[PDB]
Amino acid sequence: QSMQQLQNVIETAFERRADITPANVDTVTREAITHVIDLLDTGALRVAEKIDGQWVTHQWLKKAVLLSFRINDNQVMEGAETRYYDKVPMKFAGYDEARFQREGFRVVPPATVRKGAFIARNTVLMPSYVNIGAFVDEGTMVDTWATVGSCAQIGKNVHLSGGVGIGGVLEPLQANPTIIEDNCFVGARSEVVEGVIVEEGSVISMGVFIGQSTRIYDRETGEVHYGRVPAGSVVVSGNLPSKDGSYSLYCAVIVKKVDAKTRSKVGINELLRTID
Amino acid sequence: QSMQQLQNVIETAFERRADITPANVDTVTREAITHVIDLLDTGALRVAEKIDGQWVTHQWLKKAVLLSFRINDNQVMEGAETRYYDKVPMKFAGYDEARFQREGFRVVPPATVRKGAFIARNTVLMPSYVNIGAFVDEGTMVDTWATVGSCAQIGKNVHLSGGVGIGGVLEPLQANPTIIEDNCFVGARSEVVEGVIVEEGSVISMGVFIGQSTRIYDRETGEVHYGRVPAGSVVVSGNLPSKDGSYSLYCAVIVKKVDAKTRSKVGINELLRTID
Amino acid sequence: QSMQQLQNVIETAFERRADITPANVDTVTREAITHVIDLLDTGALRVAEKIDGQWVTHQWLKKAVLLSFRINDNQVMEGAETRYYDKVPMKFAGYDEARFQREGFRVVPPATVRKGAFIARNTVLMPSYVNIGAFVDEGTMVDTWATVGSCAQIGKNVHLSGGVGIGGVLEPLQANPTIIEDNCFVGARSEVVEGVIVEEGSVISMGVFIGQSTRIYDRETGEVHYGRVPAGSVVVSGNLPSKDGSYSLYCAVIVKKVDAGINELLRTID
Ligand SMILES: [Mg+2]
């Protein structure tokens, strides 16, 4: 209700978004937008959440994020050897040692995160990027040059290996973000985009690139999945052949299904050695 | 005469480059080199350009860039939590807020650019790197951990997705740089290099790796192209089989062709859904 | 001997590491750990090395590196526009011009390196990351968004193209690091992980992904290698088909063997 009234401000401002700019927005609307982003930043709110077993996307939070662009000017940011120019502030810009100590994760230079993304305890941010509206749950490792795009929901004990990208979804408002459920491993150079949902304890190896159009071939059943990686799927890069046999095109291949559970990297590597 | 005088200084210098050092360079030559880098930085000059439907490379600008290296010593660059040591200054180190504001683009930390690359209005540099001599035109998105290599020419309204690399080209002086023409989409994790030209309105998916080494198979005609993606090509990764079918080898496949133009990512999404 | 004594202090500490925290770590233990990391940082010690022509892995160095995390607290690190919070010091934080001049490599912003990795002379780090216990030898290029993981050994006159990741191997503790031998070219977007050894003078094309499970198919002999790219191999991405041909899965393919100019080597695909 306090929350209902916050949402009210957002839904009202967004309907008139066309005429909102940094120099005309009233103080109530600004503070409200900023409060939402603050709640997203602390994980008190989140853009999508799993309710009664289904992923629900809260449109009004995406409105809030969009409005946060519209109401803030780009500003110069001092970078020591370089300068920047952007309108989304840095999550940690203000964090002090006490706050870092209390929240219990690690941010490894030059890893950065935009204000408005939630990073949970026992996470390790290797040099990587986490965009606004994202949620990175406890125990998760984000490896070097990995990216957690806007609004993505990364569960607990997830491993985003080096250079793995999880695609942002801000617009359309109605579209769910990309979702990597608890215990998932995503191997080096892989990309999961466009609101694909990787169910819990899946194991995606290197260089597996999955958007909504990507064929996920279940070699056991012969079925082609789109848009969703079944829980416990072990998935690797492959191709499907043309009717000809004269060429073949990329796909992901489900090559084993395992029980969905927290796994070490050593464990993952050993499971990937266990495939035909 | 001014530009003729400049080019002549550079080419004359470059002829005797073996005898030019940071310690021994006269100020006229130093000034001429640094002024050419400034012209490339502001987009007043550009390493290659399209004249009469034809891409022309200007060797002398490549010679300028190469001499900019030769005449400058490495120097310690303070970076807050770390220090660097290099001889190419940083484009934005001297940018004030007014300059950023009039030039109309955004630089999202930790994105950086070397001095001597042009960045046009309405582009957004997510964390990324733009090397010396490159040209990134209006309304382009350079997404997280992407790279625009030396001398690369990126067109207007291009989307370089996360992890995309556009390969640098200095030597040979004669070689056209890597060119991405207007309205191109390039999917996450892709690399285009070695003066490959991606013609306008093309859509390259994820995980596409194209150099002069790469077969570009038109599955509609069965023809292999090298070094060029024809305008409006929709390109995905695939493989072509050995004569006996024992193995197959990576290639890029043109799966269909569209009529090149201004885009939305409703239509990028939807173009790839019709893929076979 | 002093080195034997150092190794014993490290191994004894490793043995009772479950008892050791930043809070209770004693100065003898700390000094020995920190001293090993200093030696790794200067290249005086290295995690694996080629002895009598084979690679030898010094597990106790891996134990020191592992312990260096356990015994240190995270600290806030001021970063201009942002702040960090981590427990491994930055290699260059206190370098001055004279030291850069002496060690003779370049560090292109925003390239960074953790303390406890050795960079040799005439190497160029484009924006990249070199993790603790790595050794990057002379005349090597580490191009933009490359990554040299924990303990990885990169040889002389190696080209790690843009977006090339060399996997860390702290654990398992027993494993050798990922190794790129001398004179190798690694094409952009490639990733070589899990202790794979890429032998000298190999040419790996773009977008090649090799871990310990990756079939490296020799199209000439029909061999399938695991874990090792043979010296002077030219390597590209490919697939190996299923029995019935319904689908195919990723591999590497050795498409020629050359003694010891790249684009001509690669522009031959059949
Ligand atoms: Mg910085």
PDB file of C-alpha atoms and ligand atoms in Angstrom, chain A residues 78-82 84 110 112, chain B residues 79-82 84 110 112, chain C residues 79-82 84 110 112, ligand 1:
ATOM      1  CA  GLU A  78      35.955  10.330 -13.228  1.00  0.00           C
ATOM      2  CA  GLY A  79      37.765   7.193 -14.083  1.00  0.00           C
ATOM      3  CA  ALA A  80      41.374   8.049 -13.179  1.00  0.00           C
ATOM      4  CA  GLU A  81      43.077   7.309 -16.541  1.00  0.00           C
ATOM      5  CA  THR A  82      39.829   7.897 -18.464  1.00  0.00           C
ATOM      6  CA  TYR A  84      32.938   8.272 -18.541  1.00  0.00           C
ATOM      7  CA  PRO A 110      37.651  -4.231 -12.512  1.00  0.00           C
ATOM      8  CA  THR A 112      31.354  -3.332 -11.876  1.00  0.00           C
TER       9      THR A 112
ATOM     10  CA  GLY B  79      44.223   3.936 -12.579  1.00  0.00           C
ATOM     11  CA  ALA B  80      43.141   4.161  -8.935  1.00  0.00           C
ATOM     12  CA  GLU B  81      43.297   0.571  -7.820  1.00  0.00           C
ATOM     13  CA  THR B  82      45.915  -0.217 -10.450  1.00  0.00           C
ATOM     14  CA  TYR B  84      49.001   1.134 -16.464  1.00  0.00           C
ATOM     15  CA  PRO B 110      34.248   0.892 -17.579  1.00  0.00           C
ATOM     16  CA  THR B 112      37.200   3.141 -22.810  1.00  0.00           C
TER      17      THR B 112
ATOM     18  CA  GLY C  79      38.401   2.563  -8.087  1.00  0.00           C
ATOM     19  CA  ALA C  80      37.529   6.165  -9.047  1.00  0.00           C
ATOM     20  CA  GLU C  81      33.992   5.665 -10.434  1.00  0.00           C
ATOM     21  CA  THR C  82      33.397   2.463  -8.458  1.00  0.00           C
ATOM     22  CA  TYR C  84      35.879  -3.026  -5.250  1.00  0.00           C
ATOM     23  CA  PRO C 110      42.085  -0.911 -18.522  1.00  0.00           C
ATOM     24  CA  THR C 112      44.906  -5.476 -14.969  1.00  0.00           C
TER      25      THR C 112
HETATM   26 MG    MG D   1      39.210   1.765 -13.780  1.00  0.00          MG
END
